[PDB]
Amino acid sequence: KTISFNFNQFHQNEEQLKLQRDARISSNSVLELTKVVNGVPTWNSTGRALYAKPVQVWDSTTGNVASFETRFSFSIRQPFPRPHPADGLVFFIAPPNTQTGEGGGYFGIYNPLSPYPFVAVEFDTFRNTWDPQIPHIGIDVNSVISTKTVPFTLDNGGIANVVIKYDASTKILHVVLVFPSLGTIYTIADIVDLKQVLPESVNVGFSAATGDPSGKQRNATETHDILSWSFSASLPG
Amino acid sequence: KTISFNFNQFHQNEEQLKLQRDARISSNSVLELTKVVNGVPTWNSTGRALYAKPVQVWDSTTGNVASFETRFSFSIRQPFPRPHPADGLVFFIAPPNTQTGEGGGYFGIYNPLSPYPFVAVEFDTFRNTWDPQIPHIGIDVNSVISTKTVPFTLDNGGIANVVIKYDASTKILHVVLVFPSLGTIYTIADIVDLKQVLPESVNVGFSAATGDPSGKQRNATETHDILSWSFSASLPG
Numbered sequence: 330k331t332i333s334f335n336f337n338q339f340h341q342n343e344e345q346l347k348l349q350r351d352a353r354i355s356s357n358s359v360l361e362l363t364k365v366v367n368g369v370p371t372w373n374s375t376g377r378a379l380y381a382k383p384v385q386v387w388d389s390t391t392g393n394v395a396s397f398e399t400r401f402s403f404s405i406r407q408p409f410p411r412p413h414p415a416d417g418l419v420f421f422i423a424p425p426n427t428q429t430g431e432g433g434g435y436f437g438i439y440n441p442l443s444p445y446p447f448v449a450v451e452f453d454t455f456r457n458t459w460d461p462q463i464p465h466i467g468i469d470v471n472s473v474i475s476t477k478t479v480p481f482t483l484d485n486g487g488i489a490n491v492v493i494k495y496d497a498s499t500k501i502l503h504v505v506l507v508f509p510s511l512g513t514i515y516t517i518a519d520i521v522d523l524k525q526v527l528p529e530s531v532n533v534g535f536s537a538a539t540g541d542p543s544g545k546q547r548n549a550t551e552t553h554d555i556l557s558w559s560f561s562a563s564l565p566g
Numbered sequence: 567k568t569i570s571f572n573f574n575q576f577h578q579n580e581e582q583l584k585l586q587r588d589a590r591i592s593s594n595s596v597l598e599l600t601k602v603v604n605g606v607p608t609w610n611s612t613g614r615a616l617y618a619k620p621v622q623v624w625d626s627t628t629g630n631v632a633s634f635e636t637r638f639s640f641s642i643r644q645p646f647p648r649p650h651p652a653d654g655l656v657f658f659i660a661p662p663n664t665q666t667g668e669g670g671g672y673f674g675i676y677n678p679l680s681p682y683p684f685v686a687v688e689f690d691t692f693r694n695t696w697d698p699q700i701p702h703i704g705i706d707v708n709s710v711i712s713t714k715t716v717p718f719t720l721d722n723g724g725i726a727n728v729v730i731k732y733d734a735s736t737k738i739l740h741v742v743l744v745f746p747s748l749g750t751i752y753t754i755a756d757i758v759d760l761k762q763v764l765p766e767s768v769n770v771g772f773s774a775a776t777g778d779p780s781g782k783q784r785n786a787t788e789t790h791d792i793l794s795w796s797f798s799a800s801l802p803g
């Protein structure tokens with residue numbers, strides 16, 4: 330069948346969401362993935378937000394895989410240009426009941442200790458050793474070393490519209506990033522076999538992180554706000 | 567091996583373009599694919615515009631296929647809502663030195679008594695027998711019976727931004743359609759093996775058509791204007 334939900338905005342204490350670590354919902358309705366005190370983003374922050382109920386992406390009985398579409402708006406404000414904002418945010422799919430991973434360039438979804446599979450779309454703002462120039466969009470499968478990336482220029486503090494679509498029949502994951510105020514459009518796509526990397530049931534959500542203390546730079550930070558979010562999935566099984 | 571060009575606007579008899587049939591460039595810089603007299607689009611019109619120089623999409627020696635990206639803005643104004651606007655416009659790739667094909671639902675790129683291969687992205691406004699609900703975006707390979715389609719709502723007379731990207735390593739052709747004034751975003755993608763359908767050298771361009779006389783409806787028309795166009799291709803050969 331078809332599952333779906335839509336958050337035109339976030340109401341404090343959402344029954345539908347699971348907030349982890351620093352993730353909070355502000356009084357004015359936005360989902361702040363990372364810590365922001367008195368209007369200022371801090372470093373050493375990591376937070377995630379998961380849809381409370383698990384979604385079935387595939388069925389072992391029929392062998393069918395779900396197709397899905399998710400749309401959301403986010404905003405990244407980088408108050409301090411030098412030396413380097415960090416780290417970025419991702420939309421991810423992972424097994425249910427996982428714990429926040431390592432922060433920094435791992436966005437809180439990768440745990441070197443005990444790794445769990447995941448498919449994520451990253452909006453990377455800090456160039457780690459494994460990264461190409463930033464900012465860039467990346468498609469991540471079980472790792473933060475993207476299978477494909479594309480550069481983009483951030484609209485600092487502006488709103489961004491993202492469209493992520495997965496077509497099971499072609500196994501194509503296509504993502505579109507648009508900054509309405511600048512009129513710019515970025516597109517990236519890759520082939521991903523969900524059935525091969527993920528279990529039948531998963532959690533969908535966001536995760537973000539600011540500068541890791543090991544970098545010794547308190548300015549390595551920015552906001553990671555989610556303004557709205559809609560999700561739809563169809564499993565003919 | 568990189569080839570690219572950019573047209574922020576179009577000038578009268580540009581050396582870089584090959585205009586065919588009704589295609590003409592207006593005094594105010596727009597590329598009008600189909601006939602418009604005294605601000606009114608007419609039926610029974612067909613026109614194409616090709617980049618004057620051929621581009622190499624693949625090399626028989628190395629076996630490599632080119633990756634490319636093209637961006638353009640177009641506008642479709644439909645003055646007569648009833649009974650039905652027609653027919654639409656396409657961005658296409660075909661062998662060099664082709665002639666305008668049949669008009670109507672064939673957009674001027676398909677010639678029944680001398681079919682040549684082609685890959686095209688259509689913005690279809692008239693529902694032929696082989697079509698799903700209109701308007702819709704479609705990916706066409708050697709035929710106007712799309713391999714994939716997606717519906718969209720036209721911003722009548724408004725501007726549309728299109729991004730077409732082809733990644734040779736994955737064979738994915740992804741297209742994004744955005745109507746800035748409405749803030750709507752449409753995305754479609756499919757797998758296409760250029761090397762399998764097209765020759766090493768091709769022409770890239772646009773083609774459009776208005777109502778065919780056989781429909782006996784003079785209102786079966788609309789404008790098909792191209793405002794800007796940039797193209798880039800890389801052959802690692």
Ligand SMILES: *[C@@H]1O[C@H](CO)[C@@H](O[C@@H]2O[C@H](CO)[C@@H](O[C@@H]3O[C@H](CO)[C@@H](O)[C@H](O)[C@@H]3O)[C@H](O)[C@H]2NC(C)=O)[C@H](O[C@@H]2O[C@@H](C)[C@@H](O)[C@@H](O)[C@@H]2O)[C@H]1NC(C)=O
Pocket residue numbers: 408409410411412546548
């Ligand atoms: C960490 O991030 C902070 C906040 O941006 C940086 O501090 C700021 O450094 C600016 C230097 O580009 C200062 O700008 C000056 O502003 C005044 C008035 O606004 C002008 O007259 C002058 O020409 C400059 O444009 C800005 O005042 C300062 N902000 C504050 C209140 O601290 C900081 O920069 C670096 O460290 C600070 C402590 C100073 O030593 C700066 O000179 C230095 O660039 C960022 N730190 C890092 C690691 O780069």
Ligand SMILES: *[C@@H]1O[C@H](CO)[C@@H](O[C@@H]2O[C@H](CO)[C@@H](O[C@@H]3O[C@H](CO)[C@@H](O)[C@H](O)[C@@H]3O)[C@H](O)[C@H]2NC(C)=O)[C@H](O[C@@H]2O[C@@H](C)[C@@H](O)[C@@H](O)[C@@H]2O)[C@H]1NC(C)=O
Pocket residue numbers: 645646647648649783785
């Ligand atoms: C072909 O396209 C023309 C142009 O739109 C159609 O004629 C137009 O028909 C409209 C009927 O829907 C007329 O609209 C009405 O206009 C008056 C005053 O302008 C308003 O008060 C009223 O609220 C409607 O908006 C429109 O005036 C007319 N345009 C002109 C100047 O001719 C045409 O429709 C066909 O002919 C007209 C004259 C009527 O007989 C219609 O019933 C008839 O369908 C379109 N023809 C086809 C094949 O549909």
Ligand SMILES: *[C@@H]1O[C@H](CO)[C@@H](O[C@@H]2O[C@H](CO)[C@@H](O)[C@H](O)[C@H]2NC(C)=O)[C@H](O[C@@H]2O[C@@H](C)[C@@H](O)[C@@H](O)[C@@H]2O)[C@H]1NC(C)=O
Pocket residue numbers: 610779
């Ligand atoms: C649709 O437009 C065509 C123009 O490309 C018309 O054909 C052209 O008509 C010219 C004068 O009518 C003639 O000099 C051209 O040789 C001819 N070109 C072609 C494609 O052969 C076409 O038909 C014309 O108009 C209709 C009404 C009849 O009068 C025909 O005898 C004309 O050729 C136009 N179709 C219709 C039905 O309007």
Ligand SMILES: *[C@@H]1O[C@H](CO)[C@@H](O[C@H]2O[C@H](CO)[C@@H](O)[C@H](O)[C@H]2NC(C)=O)[C@H](O[C@@H]2O[C@@H](C)[C@@H](O)[C@@H](O)[C@@H]2O)[C@H]1NC(C)=O
Pocket residue numbers: 373542
């Ligand atoms: C980065 O953020 C951490 C929060 O997770 C800070 O440590 C806190 O959490 C750890 C384990 O989760 C606890 O053991 C600490 O008691 C917590 N500290 C606080 C603020 O109450 C962490 O702070 C640093 O490390 C901890 C272990 C203490 O030594 C703090 O004094 C120290 O500042 C913070 N890192 C930095 C450098 O800001």
Ligand SMILES: OC[C@H]1O[C@H](O[C@@H]2[C@@H](O)[C@@H](O)O[C@H](CO)[C@@H]2O)[C@H](O)[C@@H](O)[C@H]1O
Pocket residue numbers: 415416432433434435455457539540541542543544545546549
């Ligand atoms: O400053 C923020 C960043 O901190 C870390 O980056 C590394 C750091 O671990 C250390 O190896 O030193 C180098 C510079 O020599 C970098 O700062 C995180 O790994 C980054 O993701 C980022 O948070």
Ligand SMILES: OC[C@H]1O[C@H](O[C@@H]2[C@@H](O)[C@@H](O)O[C@H](CO)[C@@H]2O)[C@H](O)[C@@H](O)[C@H]1O
Pocket residue numbers: 652653669670671672692694776777778779780781782783786
């Ligand atoms: O009226 C515009 C359309 O005219 C033609 O469509 C067909 C027509 O040829 C004839 O077969 O009758 C049917 C309806 O019974 C349609 O009108 C073109 O083929 C279309 O592309 C369009 O121009």
Ligand SMILES: [Ca+2]
Pocket residue numbers: 416434453454455456457460
């Ligand atoms: Ca990074």
Ligand SMILES: [Ca+2]
Pocket residue numbers: 653671690691692693694697
């Ligand atoms: Ca059609």
Ligand SMILES: [Mn+2]
Pocket residue numbers: 451453460461467473475
């Ligand atoms: Mn990255």
Ligand SMILES: [Mn+2]
Pocket residue numbers: 688690697698704710712
């Ligand atoms: Mn069609």
